[PDB]
Amino acid sequence: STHFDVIVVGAGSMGMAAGYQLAKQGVKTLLVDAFDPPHTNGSHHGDTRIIRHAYGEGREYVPLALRSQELWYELEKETHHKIFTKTGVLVFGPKGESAFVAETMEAAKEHSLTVDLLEGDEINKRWPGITVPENYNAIFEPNSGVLFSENCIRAYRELAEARGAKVLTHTRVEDFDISPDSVKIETANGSYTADKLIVSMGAWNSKLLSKLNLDIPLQPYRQVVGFFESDESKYSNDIDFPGFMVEVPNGIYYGFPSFGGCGLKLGYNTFGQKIDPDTINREFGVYPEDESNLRAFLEEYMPGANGELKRGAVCMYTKTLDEHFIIDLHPEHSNVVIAAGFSGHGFKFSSGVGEVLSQLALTGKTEHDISIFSINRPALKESLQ
Ligand SMILES: *Cc1cc2c(cc1C)nc1c(=O)[nH]c(=O)nc-1n2C[C@H](O)[C@H](O)[C@H](O)COP(=O)(O)OP(=O)(O)OC[C@H]1O[C@@H](n2cnc3c(N)ncnc32)[C@H](O)[C@@H]1O
Ligand SMILES: O=C([O-])c1ccc[nH]1
Ligand SMILES: [Cl-]
């Protein structure tokens, strides 16, 4: 005989943040997760995540990125877990041949963000360890950096539970039963009811949203990252090697400086295997592209960090057709909030989204402008059953 004010299905990056925001307000919340967050089955492991402010995916994300940054600073002061390191983020690519680089620069200009603009040999000179052609240009953002994503979720969870939130782990939600005055979920461990529901199952939204009469194109992608033994005198966070996201002819790559000798971490963002979250192979190296795509980049742009592979991780992106998020109320149920399709670039915003989700669930509205994340926008090609 236990109901709840709000139920969060999927206590990961977005869900746990929401749980923390709700618990802080004394809202009796229940968070249900198929596993035990943080874990290595979803989209939040791999240890680190980049947070950028000058948004190359679109300047409309800036306000949320800035609020998220402030919230990350708040979390740092609230927990013993490490949350953020200001490595700065470097963005580069061939001059005049990168929409990403261009939009990043424009976003920086339009929002009066503090950035450094350099090109060619200036890049190589400032950051020994980086070798780009003379025709390359870049924009460096000194105030953005790296988030320790697993620590973020763990901190949010510990804070939320301490304030009353309940977390039901290793419990997969299998169905939903929504009424105008309440919401109900069904699991093998029991059924639960509340006044409001927040759906944030990550990669699994592409399989379970149909249970909510929603037909939205969502494609999960297998994305790997590798840690490589590197020249610490050049790639360590200690010597200010920055986090980065760059565009080269074959696509977009991202990386992190070596922290305490863990080695430089690199990822190839443009490519990934289309998969099912329930049958995805989470072993690094099973596909020759896993390690080959990464070394091809390192050999050309960061030769000193192309050493032995120290560690590998397999994680998932969940893309929408326009690659913009989905944060909105269910079109037929104002008491249901949806957080989906973060298309590989949503963790940095998770703190902000947690606040947005909490507001939508409790009031049906949010102070933040989330118009570009509308669940009813045509660019999504959504529908119902
Ligand atoms: C994969 C990846 C993503 C990524 C990245 C590097 C890699 C390799 N680097 C990033 C970066 O530098 N900066 C950034 O802003 N984003 C970056 N990303 C993307 C980001 O990690 C993802 O967008 C984010 O983690 C998405 O969060 P979301 O909360 O959607 O996904 P989750 O953390 O996986 O949580 C979902 C949870 O729900 C649970 N679940 C699933 N099914 C069920 C059912 N049936 N019942 C109950 N719970 C369920 C999962 O267990 C999971 O915990
Ligand atoms: O959003 C990002 O900064 C990012 C890096 C890799 C995937 N997403
Ligand atoms: Cl994602």
Side-chain angles (χ1 to χ4, degrees):
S1 299
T2 306
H3 278 33
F4 283 97
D5 286 346
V6 181
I7 287 178
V8 182
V9 174
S13 312
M14 311 302 163
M16 200 60 85
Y20 157 92
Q21 289 290 165
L22 293 166
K24 254 174 59 180
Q25 296 178 51
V27 178
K28 191 68 182 180
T29 306
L30 169 69
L31 293 117
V32 184
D33 202 86
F35 299 104
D36 190 355
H39 55 79
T40 61
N41 291 136
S43 298
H44 54 261
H45 57 291
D47 206 277
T48 50
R49 293 284 183 287
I50 285 180
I51 171 163
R52 287 168 285 129
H53 302 164
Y55 226 52
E57 285 83 354
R59 63 199 75 179
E60 333 70 64
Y61 286 82
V62 181
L64 187 62
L66 296 184
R67 171 52 173 166
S68 293
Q69 182 63 62
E70 189 48 50
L71 284 173
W72 290 131
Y73 279 132
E74 288 189 358
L75 186 57
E76 189 80 77
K77 299 176 179 182
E78 290 172 40
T79 181
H80 64 294
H81 296 296
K82 182 69 178 196
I83 302 299
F84 172 88
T85 299
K86 195 179 68 179
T87 66
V89 179
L90 175 69
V91 170
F92 68 63
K95 286 176 51 54
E97 297 176 54
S98 176
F100 181 65
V101 174
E103 175 64 351
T104 296
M105 303 187 140
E106 270 314 85
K109 284 170 54 61
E110 185 163 303
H111 289 75
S112 179
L113 302 179
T114 303
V115 299
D116 289 337
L117 299 173
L118 52 177
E119 59 183 300
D121 186 273
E122 301 180 303
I123 301 172
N124 303 178
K125 286 297 170 298
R126 181 166 176 179
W127 294 288
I130 297 181
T131 61
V132 296
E134 292 177 47
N135 71 105
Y136 272 47
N137 67 330
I139 175 172
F140 177 67
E141 185 173 54
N143 298 141
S144 53
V146 177
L147 292 166
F148 294 93
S149 48
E150 293 166 52
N151 290 344
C152 289
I153 293 173
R154 191 180 296 288
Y156 274 151
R157 176 176 176 175
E158 294 168 359
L159 292 168
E161 291 193 63
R163 274 169 176 278
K166 300 301 180 55
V167 183
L168 188 54
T169 59
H170 302 294
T171 298
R172 182 159 180 172
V173 171
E174 297 169 353
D175 204 350
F176 304 97
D177 182 6
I178 313 301
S179 66
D181 61 302
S182 72
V183 303
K184 188 183 71 174
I185 60 170
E186 307 179 333
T187 79
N189 291 155
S191 70
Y192 297 89
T193 60
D195 294 341
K196 304 290 175 58
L197 176 72
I198 291 178
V199 185
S200 48
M201 306 171 291
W204 284 269
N205 282 149
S206 66
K207 304 184 67 175
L208 295 174
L209 286 185
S210 62
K211 290 293 188 179
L212 283 167
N213 196 203
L214 293 179
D215 180 3
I216 304 176
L218 289 172
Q219 178 62 247
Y221 283 92
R222 176 174 174 286
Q223 306 289 154
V224 309
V225 287
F227 292 75
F228 298 90
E229 197 59 65
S230 316
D231 176 356
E232 292 291 332
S233 73
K234 296 183 175 62
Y235 305 91
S236 178
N237 165 65
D238 300 329
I239 189 58
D240 293 327
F241 191 85
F244 58 93
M245 186 165 157
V246 307
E247 183 173 8
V248 291
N250 80 60
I252 295 176
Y253 293 78
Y254 58 98
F256 302 76
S258 176
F259 293 109
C262 72
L264 179 143
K265 172 184 158 179
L266 182 72
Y268 181 36
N269 175 273
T270 298
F271 171 72
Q273 299 80 35
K274 292 178 181 178
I275 52 70
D276 180 88
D278 287 323
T279 61
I280 176 181
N281 191 157
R282 300 193 177 69
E283 179 176 358
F284 183 104
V286 299
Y287 298 111
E289 300 67 52
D290 290 359
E291 180 169 349
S292 70
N293 279 164
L294 301 176
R295 287 189 183 290
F297 177 88
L298 300 172
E299 191 41 38
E300 177 71 11
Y301 304 100
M302 299 172 186
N306 197 192
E308 293 193 12
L309 178 69
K310 298 170 62 63
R311 167 186 173 188
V314 180
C315 165
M316 303 178 281
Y317 287 177
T318 303
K319 302 183 184 182
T320 50
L321 295 178
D322 64 3
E323 291 194 50
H324 294 305
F325 319 150
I326 296 175
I327 303 176
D328 200 355
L329 295 181
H330 187 304
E332 310 144 58
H333 306 291
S334 63
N335 57 350
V336 172
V337 192
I338 310 292
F342 291 95
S343 310
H345 60 105
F347 197 83
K348 67 184 78 68
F349 301 106
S350 65
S351 55
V353 177
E355 172 170 82
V356 172
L357 295 177
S358 180
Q359 292 180 176
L360 288 172
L362 298 176
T363 69
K365 303 180 299 68
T366 179
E367 49 174 335
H368 298 79
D369 172 20
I370 60 177
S371 53
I372 58 174
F373 307 131
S374 172
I375 196 168
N376 305 115
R377 66 178 189 282
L380 279 176
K381 266 53 186 176
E382 86 292 300
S383 183
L384 288 61
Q385 274 64 296

Tab-separated table of all heavy atoms in Angstrom, residues 17 22 48 93 106 116 146 153 172 179 187 207 219 236 246 259 262 270 277 283 303 319 325 371:
chain	number	residue	atom	x	y	z
A	17	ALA	N	19.066	13.079	-11.697
A	17	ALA	CA	19.130	14.524	-11.488
A	17	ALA	C	17.737	15.012	-11.100
A	17	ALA	O	17.581	15.846	-10.201
A	17	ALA	CB	19.602	15.223	-12.769
A	22	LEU	N	13.648	16.799	-7.131
A	22	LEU	CA	12.367	16.556	-6.481
A	22	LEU	C	12.534	16.328	-4.980
A	22	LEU	O	11.815	16.918	-4.177
A	22	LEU	CB	11.667	15.350	-7.126
A	22	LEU	CG	11.206	15.529	-8.579
A	22	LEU	CD1	10.864	14.181	-9.188
A	22	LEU	CD2	10.008	16.455	-8.629
A	48	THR	N	34.373	9.841	-17.711
A	48	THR	CA	34.324	11.277	-17.967
A	48	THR	C	33.421	11.751	-19.099
A	48	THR	O	33.121	11.009	-20.039
A	48	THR	CB	35.737	11.791	-18.227
A	48	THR	OG1	36.359	10.962	-19.217
A	48	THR	CG2	36.561	11.740	-16.948
A	93	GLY	N	39.402	22.336	-36.587
A	93	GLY	CA	39.061	21.665	-37.828
A	93	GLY	C	39.612	22.455	-39.001
A	93	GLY	O	40.207	23.515	-38.801
A	106	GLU	N	30.396	31.124	-33.606
A	106	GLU	CA	29.248	32.019	-33.615
A	106	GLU	C	28.512	32.013	-32.290
A	106	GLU	O	28.079	33.062	-31.815
A	106	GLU	CB	28.274	31.652	-34.733
A	106	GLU	CG	28.557	32.366	-36.039
A	106	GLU	CD	28.818	33.849	-35.835
A	106	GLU	OE1	29.978	34.218	-35.538
A	106	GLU	OE2	27.864	34.645	-35.954
A	116	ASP	N	39.374	31.762	-26.860
A	116	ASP	CA	40.612	32.134	-27.534
A	116	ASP	C	40.512	31.598	-28.952
A	116	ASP	O	40.089	30.459	-29.160
A	116	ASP	CB	41.820	31.489	-26.852
A	116	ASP	CG	42.117	32.087	-25.493
A	116	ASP	OD1	41.712	33.241	-25.243
A	116	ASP	OD2	42.771	31.403	-24.679
A	146	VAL	N	35.601	19.098	-17.862
A	146	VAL	CA	35.272	17.691	-17.727
A	146	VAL	C	34.466	17.342	-16.487
A	146	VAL	O	34.797	17.759	-15.378
A	146	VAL	CB	36.570	16.854	-17.731
A	146	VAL	CG1	36.256	15.384	-17.513
A	146	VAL	CG2	37.297	17.050	-19.057
A	153	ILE	N	26.091	11.050	-10.959
A	153	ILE	CA	24.912	10.238	-10.694
A	153	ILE	C	24.935	9.663	-9.281
A	153	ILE	O	23.914	9.671	-8.593
A	153	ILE	CB	24.780	9.104	-11.729
A	153	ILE	CG1	24.482	9.720	-13.099
A	153	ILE	CG2	23.676	8.134	-11.318
A	153	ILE	CD1	24.496	8.735	-14.237
A	172	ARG	N	13.186	-3.814	-13.801
A	172	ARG	CA	12.830	-3.305	-15.113
A	172	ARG	C	11.332	-3.044	-15.249
A	172	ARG	O	10.513	-3.924	-14.993
A	172	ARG	CB	13.297	-4.282	-16.199
A	172	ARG	CG	13.014	-3.805	-17.615
A	172	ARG	CD	13.899	-4.504	-18.637
A	172	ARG	NE	13.626	-4.046	-20.001
A	172	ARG	CZ	14.352	-4.379	-21.066
A	172	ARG	NH1	15.409	-5.174	-20.930
A	172	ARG	NH2	14.022	-3.921	-22.269
A	179	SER	N	-3.719	7.241	-16.311
A	179	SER	CA	-5.077	7.743	-16.174
A	179	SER	C	-4.945	9.258	-15.994
A	179	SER	O	-3.861	9.766	-15.709
A	179	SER	CB	-5.776	7.101	-14.970
A	179	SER	OG	-5.172	7.487	-13.752
A	187	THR	N	6.196	-3.842	-12.844
A	187	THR	CA	7.509	-4.480	-12.820
A	187	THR	C	7.349	-5.883	-12.240
A	187	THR	O	6.303	-6.214	-11.676
A	187	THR	CB	8.508	-3.709	-11.940
A	187	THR	OG1	8.267	-4.012	-10.561
A	187	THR	CG2	8.362	-2.212	-12.158
A	207	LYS	N	12.397	1.464	-27.331
A	207	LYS	CA	11.691	0.190	-27.280
A	207	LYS	C	10.461	0.230	-26.384
A	207	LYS	O	9.485	-0.474	-26.635
A	207	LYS	CB	12.623	-0.918	-26.775
A	207	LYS	CG	13.906	-1.085	-27.574
A	207	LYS	CD	14.731	-2.266	-27.069
A	207	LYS	CE	14.028	-3.592	-27.325
A	207	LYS	NZ	14.869	-4.757	-26.940
A	219	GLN	N	17.121	5.896	-32.632
A	219	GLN	CA	18.090	4.866	-32.995
A	219	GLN	C	19.282	4.755	-32.052
A	219	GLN	O	20.096	5.672	-31.955
A	219	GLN	CB	18.598	5.114	-34.418
A	219	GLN	CG	19.652	4.120	-34.892
A	219	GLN	CD	19.128	2.697	-34.936
A	219	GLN	OE1	19.563	1.838	-34.174
A	219	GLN	NE2	18.183	2.445	-35.832
A	236	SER	N	48.916	15.272	-20.025
A	236	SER	CA	48.317	15.256	-18.698
A	236	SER	C	47.494	16.505	-18.418
A	236	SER	O	47.789	17.589	-18.926
A	236	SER	CB	49.398	15.130	-17.626
A	236	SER	OG	48.825	15.157	-16.329
A	246	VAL	N	36.763	17.839	-32.062
A	246	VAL	CA	37.197	18.398	-33.332
A	246	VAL	C	36.611	17.701	-34.550
A	246	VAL	O	36.152	16.566	-34.471
A	246	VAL	CB	38.724	18.315	-33.439
A	246	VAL	CG1	39.364	18.949	-32.217
A	246	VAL	CG2	39.152	16.856	-33.558
A	259	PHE	N	44.243	11.887	-16.806
A	259	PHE	CA	44.048	12.286	-15.411
A	259	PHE	C	44.775	11.297	-14.510
A	259	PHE	O	44.457	10.102	-14.506
A	259	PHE	CB	42.559	12.296	-15.038
A	259	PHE	CG	41.759	13.359	-15.741
A	259	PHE	CD1	40.852	13.019	-16.737
A	259	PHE	CD2	41.904	14.701	-15.395
A	259	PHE	CE1	40.094	13.995	-17.378
A	259	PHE	CE2	41.150	15.692	-16.032
A	259	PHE	CZ	40.242	15.335	-17.027
A	262	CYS	N	45.873	8.063	-16.229
A	262	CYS	CA	44.943	7.077	-16.774
A	262	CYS	C	45.097	6.978	-18.284
A	262	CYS	O	44.546	6.076	-18.911
A	262	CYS	CB	43.491	7.441	-16.434
A	262	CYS	SG	42.802	8.855	-17.339
A	270	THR	N	31.360	10.430	-35.116
A	270	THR	CA	30.668	10.320	-36.394
A	270	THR	C	30.154	8.927	-36.728
A	270	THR	O	29.118	8.785	-37.376
A	270	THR	CB	31.577	10.784	-37.545
A	270	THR	OG1	31.900	12.164	-37.358
A	270	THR	CG2	30.878	10.618	-38.890
A	277	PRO	N	19.621	-2.070	-27.476
A	277	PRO	CA	20.160	-2.000	-26.115
A	277	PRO	C	20.145	-3.319	-25.340
A	277	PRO	O	20.863	-3.474	-24.355
A	277	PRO	CB	19.295	-0.921	-25.460
A	277	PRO	CG	17.982	-1.053	-26.191
A	277	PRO	CD	18.434	-1.208	-27.620
A	283	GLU	N	31.752	-5.328	-25.278
A	283	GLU	CA	33.169	-5.633	-25.148
A	283	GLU	C	33.952	-4.814	-26.167
A	283	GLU	O	33.668	-4.862	-27.364
A	283	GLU	CB	33.424	-7.125	-25.371
A	283	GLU	CG	34.894	-7.513	-25.263
A	283	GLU	CD	35.124	-9.009	-25.397
A	283	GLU	OE1	34.133	-9.758	-25.542
A	283	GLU	OE2	36.299	-9.435	-25.352
A	303	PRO	N	50.230	12.196	-31.966
A	303	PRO	CA	51.165	11.072	-32.031
A	303	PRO	C	51.744	10.580	-30.707
A	303	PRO	O	51.969	9.383	-30.547
A	303	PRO	CB	52.238	11.571	-33.006
A	303	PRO	CG	52.232	13.053	-32.774
A	303	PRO	CD	50.756	13.357	-32.707
A	319	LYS	N	19.854	8.528	-30.844
A	319	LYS	CA	19.571	9.642	-31.736
A	319	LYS	C	18.153	9.843	-32.232
A	319	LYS	O	17.395	8.889	-32.430
A	319	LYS	CB	20.465	9.556	-32.974
A	319	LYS	CG	21.953	9.560	-32.709
A	319	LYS	CD	22.707	9.540	-34.038
A	319	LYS	CE	24.207	9.435	-33.832
A	319	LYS	NZ	24.945	9.475	-35.127
A	325	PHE	N	17.360	17.024	-28.542
A	325	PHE	CA	16.677	16.264	-27.501
A	325	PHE	C	15.158	16.287	-27.539
A	325	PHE	O	14.537	16.995	-28.315
A	325	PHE	CB	17.096	16.739	-26.097
A	325	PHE	CG	18.563	17.039	-25.946
A	325	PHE	CD1	18.982	18.006	-25.036
A	325	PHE	CD2	19.525	16.338	-26.665
A	325	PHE	CE1	20.335	18.271	-24.844
A	325	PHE	CE2	20.879	16.595	-26.481
A	325	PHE	CZ	21.288	17.560	-25.571
A	371	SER	N	11.606	24.916	-26.177
A	371	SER	CA	10.832	24.818	-27.409
A	371	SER	C	11.458	23.930	-28.479
A	371	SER	O	10.751	23.206	-29.175
A	371	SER	CB	10.583	26.217	-27.979
A	371	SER	OG	11.796	26.931	-28.121
